[PDB]
Amino acid sequence: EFYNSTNEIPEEMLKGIDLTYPQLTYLPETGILYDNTYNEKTVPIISGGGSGHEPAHVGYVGSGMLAAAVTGPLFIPPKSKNILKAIRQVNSGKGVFVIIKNFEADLKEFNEAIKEARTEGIDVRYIVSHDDISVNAYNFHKRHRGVAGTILLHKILGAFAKEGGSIDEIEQLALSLSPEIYTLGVALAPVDEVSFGIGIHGEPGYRVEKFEGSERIAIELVNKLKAEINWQKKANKNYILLVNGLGSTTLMELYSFQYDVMRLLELEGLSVKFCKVGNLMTSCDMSGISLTLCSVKDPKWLDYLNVPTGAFAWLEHHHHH
Amino acid sequence: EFYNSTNEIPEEMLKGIDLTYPQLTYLPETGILYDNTYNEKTVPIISGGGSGHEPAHVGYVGSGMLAAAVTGPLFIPPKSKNILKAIRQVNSGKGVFVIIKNFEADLKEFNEAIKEARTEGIDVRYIVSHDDISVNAYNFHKRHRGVAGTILLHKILGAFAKEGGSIDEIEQLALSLSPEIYTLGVALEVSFGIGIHGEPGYRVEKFEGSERIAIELVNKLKAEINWQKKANKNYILLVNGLGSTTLMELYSFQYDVMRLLELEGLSVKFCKVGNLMTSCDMSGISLTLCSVKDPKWLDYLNVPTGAFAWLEHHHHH
């Protein structure tokens, strides 16, 4: 690799992002990247986590999405001191809402910062992203990590905030949305072998087999998602889909896979009302894909997904169409 | 790899892109992807080439950029019949402009279709992209392939077309822009000047950090551009990942490159970073520099498009 950020904030990367986008500024030595056009008129949403997953979360900072993201070393969450610094900065007395991915280390650092901010008079509220339905190789309980479906919280909560939602209303929206999101991934590795339900850090999949084409990979992931969501039994047939490359899978492979998945989900009697395809949350250079499904439980969520943002990894909107 | 499109149009990929994007339509079995929003009031620009370089050129189809792109099998240009299909469809008697990357096979196929269209009364004109300053590792003659800076042609000509540029004026602009564009890449041992299809670099050396890599690429770019001799110090920069290089590495590299360019006395006035034109899953980066020869070029770069790989614009700022 060209750079390695084991044990250090990726300072060069964050400075490069600042240099590229007029609307983003980075605070050196802190890992904090912020939307410099944010005017404090609406409730801010922030997030953060380890490097190694870009564009999560640096590519989701911008108008209509996150006001700031705090990035730590490779696969290590930011320190509570830098999280607290970011909370105080975006705060203006209207509350601050935090999205935290469900990892032990991330929980500890965010908890510590949020507790401290609240003692200072800041009304910080939070939701924990837990969409990963892969399972722990030891006892077969779901891992419940926060993975690529986290970005749907960034997008929907950011858009409702931008339209004027109060801190109380954003929390209630978060509590409704978060349970609806389900994500499952697969990786390839040479011996070629296919690991279904690979963890976001390479943890073992629930089943490994010889590669014999991607149609059967799509069938398996769809069948495993069906076992959790049970869409066969649910009246609302409308879904949001993400097809996410985990780092080294090509656009050709991602859109080919999207095609196979869409054909299967059509046969399941579902209507995919929104989809987004690309490297949305990676794991270094892993060769794999994850699929995220989320019920369109409120039709308004489609409006919130389609609205334009200033964040570099979500610049598209329905005025394109 | 989950799919392999050796020898065939990447039909599922194209169908998938179609399902994703309302403003894009794919024509089954042709490799033709088009902007279904295009209204024929302006001169259409089109391109194409083999699969394996995505988003070049499917990601650059949309309002303000290409009205269509024609994609062939892995590393094989589309057949002339499909190119000519595309030309006929975008045509409305206002001319049609084609951007062709400088590879022997692409030139044969596009030439066949262009001359055929011309004898059917279509005023088709073209420019050849040749920004690659890498060298054949024996003999060191420049290769002059069309590589990532091609997308500067798409964006500038597209935006000028969209603005109402005549076919005459677009060709003149294309002839002005094309010679300003210079691009060199590196793969990961480090191989400097790796070919776009994996051909050997001019020098292989041990990895000793990316600062020395930025220095070597900027030095080779300088040898061609000679920016120290020219009073206009304004440039456009692309930092392009060649397939499996991560965003962390690409923006880190941009940073190191911008540190050096500023010490050279240059003002980088527009920058774009990402997987802009790839080579399968190759681990590597290319840098493109282009003189802001005419200040209006920046307007053309900053204007909004509907193409999926180029959605940034100046209202974000």
Side-chain angles (χ1 to χ4, degrees), chain A residues 1-3 12-13 20-21 23 188 214 252-253 255-258 260 315 320-321, chain B residues 1-3 12-13 20-21 23 207 210 248-249 251-256 311 316:
Chain A
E1 54 231 57
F2 285 96
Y3 296 81
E12 294 87 2
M13 173 188 83
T20 302
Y21 306 103
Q23 72 265 30
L188 304 191
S214 284
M252 185 276 288
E253 287 164 276
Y255 286 101
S256 302
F257 201 64
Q258 146 92 337
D260 283 329
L315 291 166
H320 298 144
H321 302 167
Chain B
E1 68 198 352
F2 291 95
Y3 295 87
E12 298 67 44
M13 174 193 86
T20 311
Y21 296 108
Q23 344 89 59
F207 184 76
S210 283
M248 183 279 298
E249 290 166 278
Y251 281 102
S252 297
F253 206 64
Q254 204 256 12
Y255 168 77
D256 268 316
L311 298 166
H316 300 142

mmCIF file of all heavy atoms in Angstrom, chain A residues 1-3 12-13 20-21 23 188 214 252-253 255-258 260 315 320-321, chain B residues 1-3 12-13 20-21 23 207 210 248-249 251-256 311 316:
data_model
loop_
_atom_site.group_PDB
_atom_site.id
_atom_site.type_symbol
_atom_site.label_atom_id
_atom_site.label_comp_id
_atom_site.label_asym_id
_atom_site.label_seq_id
_atom_site.Cartn_x
_atom_site.Cartn_y
_atom_site.Cartn_z
ATOM 1 N N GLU A 1 0.837 -1.257 0.000
ATOM 2 C CA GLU A 1 0.000 0.000 0.000
ATOM 3 C C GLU A 1 0.851 1.277 0.000
ATOM 4 O O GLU A 1 2.020 1.262 0.427
ATOM 5 C CB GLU A 1 -1.022 0.009 1.146
ATOM 6 C CG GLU A 1 -0.403 -0.218 2.526
ATOM 7 C CD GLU A 1 -1.092 -1.324 3.329
ATOM 8 O OE1 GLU A 1 -1.173 -2.475 2.835
ATOM 9 O OE2 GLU A 1 -1.553 -1.032 4.462
ATOM 10 N N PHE A 2 0.258 2.368 -0.483
ATOM 11 C CA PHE A 2 0.958 3.648 -0.660
ATOM 12 C C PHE A 2 1.179 4.364 0.678
ATOM 13 O O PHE A 2 2.170 5.077 0.866
ATOM 14 C CB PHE A 2 0.250 4.549 -1.700
ATOM 15 C CG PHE A 2 0.473 4.093 -3.135
ATOM 16 C CD1 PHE A 2 -0.467 3.280 -3.801
ATOM 17 C CD2 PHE A 2 1.614 4.466 -3.822
ATOM 18 C CE1 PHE A 2 -0.269 2.853 -5.126
ATOM 19 C CE2 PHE A 2 1.823 4.024 -5.178
ATOM 20 C CZ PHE A 2 0.862 3.215 -5.816
ATOM 21 N N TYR A 3 0.244 4.158 1.603
ATOM 22 C CA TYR A 3 0.261 4.773 2.946
ATOM 23 C C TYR A 3 -0.337 3.738 3.887
ATOM 24 O O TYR A 3 -1.177 2.932 3.483
ATOM 25 C CB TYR A 3 -0.604 6.060 3.010
ATOM 26 C CG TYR A 3 -0.041 7.130 2.109
ATOM 27 C CD1 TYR A 3 -0.294 7.112 0.726
ATOM 28 C CD2 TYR A 3 0.759 8.151 2.622
ATOM 29 C CE1 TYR A 3 0.224 8.088 -0.119
ATOM 30 C CE2 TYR A 3 1.278 9.123 1.785
ATOM 31 C CZ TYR A 3 1.012 9.095 0.418
ATOM 32 O OH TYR A 3 1.549 10.081 -0.402
ATOM 33 N N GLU A 12 -2.584 12.950 6.318
ATOM 34 C CA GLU A 12 -2.412 13.291 4.910
ATOM 35 C C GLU A 12 -3.732 13.128 4.158
ATOM 36 O O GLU A 12 -4.081 13.948 3.325
ATOM 37 C CB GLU A 12 -1.346 12.404 4.246
ATOM 38 C CG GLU A 12 0.077 12.671 4.822
ATOM 39 C CD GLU A 12 0.406 11.848 6.086
ATOM 40 O OE1 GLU A 12 -0.406 11.012 6.562
ATOM 41 O OE2 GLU A 12 1.515 12.039 6.623
ATOM 42 N N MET A 13 -4.467 12.061 4.455
ATOM 43 C CA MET A 13 -5.680 11.789 3.718
ATOM 44 C C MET A 13 -6.674 12.891 4.031
ATOM 45 O O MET A 13 -7.360 13.449 3.167
ATOM 46 C CB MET A 13 -6.300 10.509 4.244
ATOM 47 C CG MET A 13 -7.678 10.312 3.577
ATOM 48 S SD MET A 13 -8.614 8.933 4.318
ATOM 49 C CE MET A 13 -9.361 9.713 5.767
ATOM 50 N N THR A 20 -9.250 19.191 -1.673
ATOM 51 C CA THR A 20 -10.139 18.843 -2.789
ATOM 52 C C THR A 20 -11.521 19.512 -2.787
ATOM 53 O O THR A 20 -11.995 19.881 -3.858
ATOM 54 C CB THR A 20 -10.271 17.310 -2.907
ATOM 55 O OG1 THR A 20 -8.963 16.740 -3.090
ATOM 56 C CG2 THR A 20 -11.137 16.897 -4.121
ATOM 57 N N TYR A 21 -12.147 19.659 -1.614
ATOM 58 C CA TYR A 21 -13.525 20.164 -1.444
ATOM 59 C C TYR A 21 -13.595 21.492 -0.686
ATOM 60 O O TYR A 21 -13.346 21.510 0.521
ATOM 61 C CB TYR A 21 -14.406 19.107 -0.740
ATOM 62 C CG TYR A 21 -14.311 17.802 -1.523
ATOM 63 C CD1 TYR A 21 -13.525 16.727 -1.072
ATOM 64 C CD2 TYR A 21 -14.993 17.657 -2.727
ATOM 65 C CE1 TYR A 21 -13.438 15.527 -1.818
ATOM 66 C CE2 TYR A 21 -14.907 16.449 -3.486
ATOM 67 C CZ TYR A 21 -14.121 15.403 -3.020
ATOM 68 O OH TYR A 21 -14.029 14.230 -3.748
ATOM 69 N N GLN A 23 -15.948 23.087 0.523
ATOM 70 C CA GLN A 23 -16.974 23.076 1.567
ATOM 71 C C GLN A 23 -16.654 22.278 2.825
ATOM 72 O O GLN A 23 -17.431 22.315 3.788
ATOM 73 C CB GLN A 23 -18.304 22.576 0.985
ATOM 74 C CG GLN A 23 -18.336 21.036 0.669
ATOM 75 C CD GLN A 23 -18.001 20.744 -0.785
ATOM 76 O OE1 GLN A 23 -17.244 21.486 -1.421
ATOM 77 N NE2 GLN A 23 -18.561 19.655 -1.322
ATOM 78 N N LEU A 188 -14.461 -12.717 -1.509
ATOM 79 C CA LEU A 188 -13.693 -13.731 -2.254
ATOM 80 C C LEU A 188 -12.262 -13.747 -1.761
ATOM 81 O O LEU A 188 -11.704 -12.696 -1.468
ATOM 82 C CB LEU A 188 -13.655 -13.416 -3.755
ATOM 83 C CG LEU A 188 -15.000 -13.244 -4.481
ATOM 84 C CD1 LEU A 188 -14.712 -13.215 -5.997
ATOM 85 C CD2 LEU A 188 -15.860 -14.458 -4.176
ATOM 86 N N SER A 214 -21.447 -15.944 -9.719
ATOM 87 C CA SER A 214 -22.057 -14.992 -8.810
ATOM 88 C C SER A 214 -23.566 -15.066 -8.711
ATOM 89 O O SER A 214 -24.130 -14.585 -7.751
ATOM 90 C CB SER A 214 -21.625 -13.610 -9.231
ATOM 91 O OG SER A 214 -20.287 -13.440 -8.796
ATOM 92 N N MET A 252 -17.538 -2.972 -12.662
ATOM 93 C CA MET A 252 -18.185 -3.947 -13.518
ATOM 94 C C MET A 252 -18.830 -5.038 -12.656
ATOM 95 O O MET A 252 -19.966 -5.465 -12.910
ATOM 96 C CB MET A 252 -17.162 -4.568 -14.466
ATOM 97 C CG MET A 252 -17.738 -5.516 -15.500
ATOM 98 S SD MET A 252 -17.981 -7.209 -14.903
ATOM 99 C CE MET A 252 -16.291 -7.792 -14.800
ATOM 100 N N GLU A 253 -18.124 -5.517 -11.637
ATOM 101 C CA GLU A 253 -18.651 -6.627 -10.833
ATOM 102 C C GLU A 253 -19.815 -6.141 -9.990
ATOM 103 O O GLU A 253 -20.787 -6.855 -9.778
ATOM 104 C CB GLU A 253 -17.569 -7.141 -9.882
ATOM 105 C CG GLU A 253 -16.476 -7.933 -10.598
ATOM 106 C CD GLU A 253 -15.263 -8.079 -9.687
ATOM 107 O OE1 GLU A 253 -14.428 -7.154 -9.642
ATOM 108 O OE2 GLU A 253 -15.136 -9.116 -9.008
ATOM 109 N N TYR A 255 -22.098 -3.641 -10.523
ATOM 110 C CA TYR A 255 -23.335 -3.487 -11.301
ATOM 111 C C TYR A 255 -23.834 -4.812 -11.887
ATOM 112 O O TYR A 255 -25.040 -5.037 -11.979
ATOM 113 C CB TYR A 255 -23.169 -2.407 -12.387
ATOM 114 C CG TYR A 255 -23.178 -1.002 -11.822
ATOM 115 C CD1 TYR A 255 -21.995 -0.306 -11.623
ATOM 116 C CD2 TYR A 255 -24.370 -0.364 -11.487
ATOM 117 C CE1 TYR A 255 -21.993 1.019 -11.092
ATOM 118 C CE2 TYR A 255 -24.386 0.943 -10.958
ATOM 119 C CZ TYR A 255 -23.188 1.635 -10.763
ATOM 120 O OH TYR A 255 -23.156 2.932 -10.236
ATOM 121 N N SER A 256 -22.943 -5.713 -12.288
ATOM 122 C CA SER A 256 -23.375 -7.066 -12.665
ATOM 123 C C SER A 256 -24.096 -7.777 -11.505
ATOM 124 O O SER A 256 -25.119 -8.476 -11.690
ATOM 125 C CB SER A 256 -22.201 -7.943 -13.091
ATOM 126 O OG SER A 256 -21.515 -7.372 -14.169
ATOM 127 N N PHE A 257 -23.554 -7.613 -10.302
ATOM 128 C CA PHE A 257 -24.165 -8.217 -9.119
ATOM 129 C C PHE A 257 -25.509 -7.570 -8.779
ATOM 130 O O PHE A 257 -26.490 -8.271 -8.521
ATOM 131 C CB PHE A 257 -23.253 -8.070 -7.886
ATOM 132 C CG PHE A 257 -23.564 -9.079 -6.806
ATOM 133 C CD1 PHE A 257 -23.389 -10.436 -7.045
ATOM 134 C CD2 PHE A 257 -24.029 -8.675 -5.583
ATOM 135 C CE1 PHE A 257 -23.675 -11.369 -6.054
ATOM 136 C CE2 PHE A 257 -24.322 -9.602 -4.570
ATOM 137 C CZ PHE A 257 -24.146 -10.946 -4.804
ATOM 138 N N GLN A 258 -25.545 -6.242 -8.780
ATOM 139 C CA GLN A 258 -26.819 -5.509 -8.709
ATOM 140 C C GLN A 258 -27.891 -6.034 -9.680
ATOM 141 O O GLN A 258 -29.066 -6.194 -9.329
ATOM 142 C CB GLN A 258 -26.548 -4.010 -8.900
ATOM 143 C CG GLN A 258 -27.620 -3.233 -9.629
ATOM 144 C CD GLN A 258 -28.596 -2.660 -8.657
ATOM 145 O OE1 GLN A 258 -28.723 -3.173 -7.551
ATOM 146 N NE2 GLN A 258 -29.299 -1.600 -9.048
ATOM 147 N N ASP A 260 -28.150 -9.123 -10.940
ATOM 148 C CA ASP A 260 -28.616 -10.429 -10.470
ATOM 149 C C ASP A 260 -29.510 -10.271 -9.243
ATOM 150 O O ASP A 260 -30.556 -10.926 -9.143
ATOM 151 C CB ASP A 260 -27.439 -11.380 -10.162
ATOM 152 C CG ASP A 260 -26.811 -11.970 -11.412
ATOM 153 O OD1 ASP A 260 -27.542 -12.168 -12.402
ATOM 154 O OD2 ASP A 260 -25.579 -12.241 -11.425
ATOM 155 N N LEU A 315 -23.603 12.760 -3.856
ATOM 156 C CA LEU A 315 -23.913 14.038 -4.511
ATOM 157 C C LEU A 315 -25.149 13.947 -5.423
ATOM 158 O O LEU A 315 -25.620 14.953 -5.954
ATOM 159 C CB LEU A 315 -22.703 14.546 -5.324
ATOM 160 C CG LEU A 315 -21.498 14.992 -4.503
ATOM 161 C CD1 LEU A 315 -20.273 15.137 -5.421
ATOM 162 C CD2 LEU A 315 -21.760 16.292 -3.685
ATOM 163 N N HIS A 320 -31.572 15.132 -11.151
ATOM 164 C CA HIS A 320 -30.938 14.323 -12.204
ATOM 165 C C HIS A 320 -31.900 13.565 -13.144
ATOM 166 O O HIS A 320 -31.692 13.538 -14.367
ATOM 167 C CB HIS A 320 -29.918 13.356 -11.583
ATOM 168 C CG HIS A 320 -28.792 14.053 -10.886
ATOM 169 N ND1 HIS A 320 -28.211 13.570 -9.731
ATOM 170 C CD2 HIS A 320 -28.138 15.202 -11.185
ATOM 171 C CE1 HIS A 320 -27.250 14.392 -9.347
ATOM 172 N NE2 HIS A 320 -27.183 15.390 -10.211
ATOM 173 N N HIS A 321 -32.942 12.964 -12.564
ATOM 174 C CA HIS A 321 -33.709 11.866 -13.173
ATOM 175 C C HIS A 321 -34.276 12.063 -14.577
ATOM 176 O O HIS A 321 -35.144 12.898 -14.825
ATOM 177 C CB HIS A 321 -34.770 11.366 -12.188
ATOM 178 C CG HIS A 321 -34.187 10.899 -10.888
ATOM 179 N ND1 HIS A 321 -34.952 10.647 -9.767
ATOM 180 C CD2 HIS A 321 -32.903 10.639 -10.532
ATOM 181 C CE1 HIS A 321 -34.166 10.249 -8.778
ATOM 182 N NE2 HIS A 321 -32.918 10.236 -9.216
ATOM 183 N N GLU B 1 -12.494 -12.437 -8.682
ATOM 184 C CA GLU B 1 -13.495 -11.623 -9.460
ATOM 185 C C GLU B 1 -14.870 -12.327 -9.545
ATOM 186 O O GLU B 1 -14.941 -13.514 -9.866
ATOM 187 C CB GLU B 1 -12.949 -11.328 -10.870
ATOM 188 C CG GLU B 1 -12.856 -12.595 -11.731
ATOM 189 C CD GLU B 1 -11.940 -12.458 -12.945
ATOM 190 O OE1 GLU B 1 -11.476 -11.330 -13.230
ATOM 191 O OE2 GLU B 1 -11.690 -13.490 -13.617
ATOM 192 N N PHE B 2 -15.946 -11.582 -9.259
ATOM 193 C CA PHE B 2 -17.332 -12.084 -9.247
ATOM 194 C C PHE B 2 -17.891 -12.318 -10.669
ATOM 195 O O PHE B 2 -18.780 -13.121 -10.874
ATOM 196 C CB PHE B 2 -18.229 -11.084 -8.485
ATOM 197 C CG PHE B 2 -17.955 -11.012 -6.996
ATOM 198 C CD1 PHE B 2 -17.109 -10.045 -6.478
ATOM 199 C CD2 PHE B 2 -18.548 -11.912 -6.112
ATOM 200 C CE1 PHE B 2 -16.845 -9.969 -5.102
ATOM 201 C CE2 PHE B 2 -18.290 -11.843 -4.723
ATOM 202 C CZ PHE B 2 -17.428 -10.855 -4.223
ATOM 203 N N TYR B 3 -17.355 -11.595 -11.650
ATOM 204 C CA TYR B 3 -17.801 -11.683 -13.043
ATOM 205 C C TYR B 3 -16.565 -11.457 -13.916
ATOM 206 O O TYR B 3 -15.603 -10.793 -13.503
ATOM 207 C CB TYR B 3 -18.828 -10.581 -13.350
ATOM 208 C CG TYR B 3 -20.101 -10.750 -12.572
ATOM 209 C CD1 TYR B 3 -20.236 -10.211 -11.280
ATOM 210 C CD2 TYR B 3 -21.173 -11.457 -13.123
ATOM 211 C CE1 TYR B 3 -21.430 -10.377 -10.557
ATOM 212 C CE2 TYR B 3 -22.364 -11.628 -12.413
ATOM 213 C CZ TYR B 3 -22.486 -11.083 -11.130
ATOM 214 O OH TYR B 3 -23.673 -11.271 -10.454
ATOM 215 N N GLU B 12 -24.716 -7.667 -18.229
ATOM 216 C CA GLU B 12 -25.379 -7.525 -16.929
ATOM 217 C C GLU B 12 -24.991 -6.208 -16.255
ATOM 218 O O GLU B 12 -25.815 -5.541 -15.624
ATOM 219 C CB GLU B 12 -25.005 -8.687 -16.010
ATOM 220 C CG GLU B 12 -25.438 -10.041 -16.524
ATOM 221 C CD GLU B 12 -24.695 -10.458 -17.786
ATOM 222 O OE1 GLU B 12 -23.456 -10.289 -17.869
ATOM 223 O OE2 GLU B 12 -25.371 -10.959 -18.700
ATOM 224 N N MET B 13 -23.724 -5.833 -16.386
ATOM 225 C CA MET B 13 -23.268 -4.573 -15.819
ATOM 226 C C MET B 13 -24.092 -3.414 -16.394
ATOM 227 O O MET B 13 -24.586 -2.535 -15.664
ATOM 228 C CB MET B 13 -21.789 -4.341 -16.141
ATOM 229 C CG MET B 13 -21.293 -2.967 -15.693
ATOM 230 S SD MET B 13 -19.701 -2.495 -16.361
ATOM 231 C CE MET B 13 -20.172 -1.766 -17.948
ATOM 232 N N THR B 20 -30.271 1.152 -12.056
ATOM 233 C CA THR B 20 -29.888 2.133 -11.053
ATOM 234 C C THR B 20 -30.321 3.581 -11.330
ATOM 235 O O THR B 20 -30.718 4.288 -10.399
ATOM 236 C CB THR B 20 -28.381 2.041 -10.718
ATOM 237 O OG1 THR B 20 -28.083 0.676 -10.457
ATOM 238 C CG2 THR B 20 -28.016 2.839 -9.459
ATOM 239 N N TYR B 21 -30.242 4.011 -12.589
ATOM 240 C CA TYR B 21 -30.186 5.435 -12.927
ATOM 241 C C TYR B 21 -31.308 5.705 -13.927
ATOM 242 O O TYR B 21 -31.229 5.278 -15.078
ATOM 243 C CB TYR B 21 -28.822 5.821 -13.519
ATOM 244 C CG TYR B 21 -27.687 5.632 -12.530
ATOM 245 C CD1 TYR B 21 -26.771 4.604 -12.680
ATOM 246 C CD2 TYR B 21 -27.547 6.483 -11.441
ATOM 247 C CE1 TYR B 21 -25.738 4.428 -11.765
ATOM 248 C CE2 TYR B 21 -26.526 6.314 -10.533
ATOM 249 C CZ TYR B 21 -25.621 5.280 -10.701
ATOM 250 O OH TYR B 21 -24.608 5.121 -9.779
ATOM 251 N N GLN B 23 -32.121 8.242 -15.604
ATOM 252 C CA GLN B 23 -31.822 9.117 -16.732
ATOM 253 C C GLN B 23 -30.930 8.407 -17.730
ATOM 254 O O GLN B 23 -30.557 8.994 -18.758
ATOM 255 C CB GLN B 23 -31.115 10.378 -16.252
ATOM 256 C CG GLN B 23 -31.273 10.565 -14.754
ATOM 257 C CD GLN B 23 -30.181 9.880 -13.910
ATOM 258 O OE1 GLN B 23 -29.000 10.170 -14.052
ATOM 259 N NE2 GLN B 23 -30.593 8.975 -13.032
ATOM 260 N N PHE B 207 9.784 -0.285 -2.686
ATOM 261 C CA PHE B 207 8.946 0.698 -2.011
ATOM 262 C C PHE B 207 9.642 1.315 -0.797
ATOM 263 O O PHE B 207 10.023 0.615 0.142
ATOM 264 C CB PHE B 207 7.578 0.129 -1.619
ATOM 265 C CG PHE B 207 6.665 1.164 -1.006
ATOM 266 C CD1 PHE B 207 6.032 2.101 -1.804
ATOM 267 C CD2 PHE B 207 6.451 1.199 0.367
ATOM 268 C CE1 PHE B 207 5.191 3.065 -1.247
ATOM 269 C CE2 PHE B 207 5.613 2.157 0.933
ATOM 270 C CZ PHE B 207 4.988 3.087 0.120
ATOM 271 N N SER B 210 5.799 7.010 -0.256
ATOM 272 C CA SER B 210 5.110 7.539 -1.421
ATOM 273 C C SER B 210 5.551 8.955 -1.739
ATOM 274 O O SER B 210 5.294 9.466 -2.813
ATOM 275 C CB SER B 210 3.594 7.524 -1.216
ATOM 276 O OG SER B 210 3.093 6.190 -1.385
ATOM 277 N N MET B 248 -8.163 6.151 1.116
ATOM 278 C CA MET B 248 -7.178 6.693 2.058
ATOM 279 C C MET B 248 -5.865 6.936 1.300
ATOM 280 O O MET B 248 -5.217 7.971 1.464
ATOM 281 C CB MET B 248 -6.954 5.728 3.224
ATOM 282 C CG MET B 248 -6.016 6.225 4.296
ATOM 283 S SD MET B 248 -4.271 6.000 3.876
ATOM 284 C CE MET B 248 -4.175 4.211 3.737
ATOM 285 N N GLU B 249 -5.449 5.993 0.450
ATOM 286 C CA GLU B 249 -4.164 6.185 -0.255
ATOM 287 C C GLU B 249 -4.240 7.298 -1.297
ATOM 288 O O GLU B 249 -3.298 8.073 -1.482
ATOM 289 C CB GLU B 249 -3.806 4.875 -0.981
ATOM 290 C CG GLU B 249 -3.424 3.762 -0.020
ATOM 291 C CD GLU B 249 -3.419 2.396 -0.740
ATOM 292 O OE1 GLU B 249 -4.487 1.795 -0.905
ATOM 293 O OE2 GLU B 249 -2.343 1.926 -1.144
ATOM 294 N N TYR B 251 -6.216 10.090 -1.427
ATOM 295 C CA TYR B 251 -6.225 11.466 -0.911
ATOM 296 C C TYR B 251 -4.890 11.767 -0.224
ATOM 297 O O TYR B 251 -4.420 12.897 -0.267
ATOM 298 C CB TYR B 251 -7.406 11.677 0.053
ATOM 299 C CG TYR B 251 -8.703 11.896 -0.688
ATOM 300 C CD1 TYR B 251 -9.645 10.863 -0.804
ATOM 301 C CD2 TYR B 251 -9.007 13.116 -1.282
ATOM 302 C CE1 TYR B 251 -10.847 11.044 -1.490
ATOM 303 C CE2 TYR B 251 -10.236 13.310 -1.981
ATOM 304 C CZ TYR B 251 -11.152 12.259 -2.081
ATOM 305 O OH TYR B 251 -12.364 12.413 -2.759
ATOM 306 N N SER B 252 -4.275 10.760 0.406
ATOM 307 C CA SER B 252 -2.945 10.927 0.987
ATOM 308 C C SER B 252 -1.981 11.326 -0.099
ATOM 309 O O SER B 252 -1.250 12.307 0.073
ATOM 310 C CB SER B 252 -2.471 9.675 1.732
ATOM 311 O OG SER B 252 -3.348 9.418 2.826
ATOM 312 N N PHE B 253 -1.981 10.583 -1.206
ATOM 313 C CA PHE B 253 -1.166 10.934 -2.378
ATOM 314 C C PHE B 253 -1.475 12.320 -2.948
ATOM 315 O O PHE B 253 -0.573 13.079 -3.272
ATOM 316 C CB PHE B 253 -1.308 9.878 -3.508
ATOM 317 C CG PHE B 253 -0.097 9.798 -4.458
ATOM 318 C CD1 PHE B 253 1.150 9.411 -3.994
ATOM 319 C CD2 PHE B 253 -0.226 10.113 -5.820
ATOM 320 C CE1 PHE B 253 2.263 9.333 -4.855
ATOM 321 C CE2 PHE B 253 0.878 10.041 -6.694
ATOM 322 C CZ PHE B 253 2.122 9.651 -6.213
ATOM 323 N N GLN B 254 -2.739 12.684 -3.092
ATOM 324 C CA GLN B 254 -3.041 14.054 -3.507
ATOM 325 C C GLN B 254 -2.290 15.080 -2.645
ATOM 326 O O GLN B 254 -1.714 16.055 -3.160
ATOM 327 C CB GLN B 254 -4.549 14.281 -3.347
ATOM 328 C CG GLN B 254 -5.064 15.396 -4.241
ATOM 329 C CD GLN B 254 -5.316 16.645 -3.475
ATOM 330 O OE1 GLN B 254 -4.897 16.766 -2.312
ATOM 331 N NE2 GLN B 254 -5.999 17.606 -4.112
ATOM 332 N N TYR B 255 -2.303 14.844 -1.335
ATOM 333 C CA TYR B 255 -1.725 15.767 -0.371
ATOM 334 C C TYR B 255 -0.249 15.886 -0.685
ATOM 335 O O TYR B 255 0.296 16.985 -0.734
ATOM 336 C CB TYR B 255 -1.934 15.268 1.055
ATOM 337 C CG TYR B 255 -1.098 16.031 2.055
ATOM 338 C CD1 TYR B 255 -1.475 17.303 2.453
ATOM 339 C CD2 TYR B 255 0.067 15.470 2.604
ATOM 340 C CE1 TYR B 255 -0.720 18.004 3.361
ATOM 341 C CE2 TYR B 255 0.817 16.160 3.504
ATOM 342 C CZ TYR B 255 0.419 17.434 3.884
ATOM 343 O OH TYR B 255 1.158 18.167 4.802
ATOM 344 N N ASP B 256 0.415 14.759 -0.912
ATOM 345 C CA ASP B 256 1.872 14.805 -1.089
ATOM 346 C C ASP B 256 2.206 15.509 -2.401
ATOM 347 O O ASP B 256 3.182 16.278 -2.504
ATOM 348 C CB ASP B 256 2.461 13.380 -1.042
ATOM 349 C CG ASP B 256 2.892 12.984 0.375
ATOM 350 O OD1 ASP B 256 3.526 13.805 1.072
ATOM 351 O OD2 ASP B 256 2.607 11.857 0.808
ATOM 352 N N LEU B 311 -20.521 14.211 -10.383
ATOM 353 C CA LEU B 311 -21.697 14.925 -9.904
ATOM 354 C C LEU B 311 -21.294 16.153 -9.068
ATOM 355 O O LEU B 311 -22.158 16.879 -8.606
ATOM 356 C CB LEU B 311 -22.554 13.982 -9.047
ATOM 357 C CG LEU B 311 -23.166 12.722 -9.687
ATOM 358 C CD1 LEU B 311 -23.664 11.800 -8.588
ATOM 359 C CD2 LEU B 311 -24.337 13.100 -10.599
ATOM 360 N N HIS B 316 -22.030 23.322 -4.477
ATOM 361 C CA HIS B 316 -21.539 22.685 -3.248
ATOM 362 C C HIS B 316 -20.625 23.540 -2.351
ATOM 363 O O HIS B 316 -20.559 23.323 -1.135
ATOM 364 C CB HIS B 316 -20.861 21.361 -3.594
ATOM 365 C CG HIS B 316 -21.783 20.406 -4.278
ATOM 366 N ND1 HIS B 316 -21.379 19.570 -5.300
ATOM 367 C CD2 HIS B 316 -23.104 20.164 -4.080
ATOM 368 C CE1 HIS B 316 -22.416 18.850 -5.702
ATOM 369 N NE2 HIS B 316 -23.471 19.191 -4.979
#
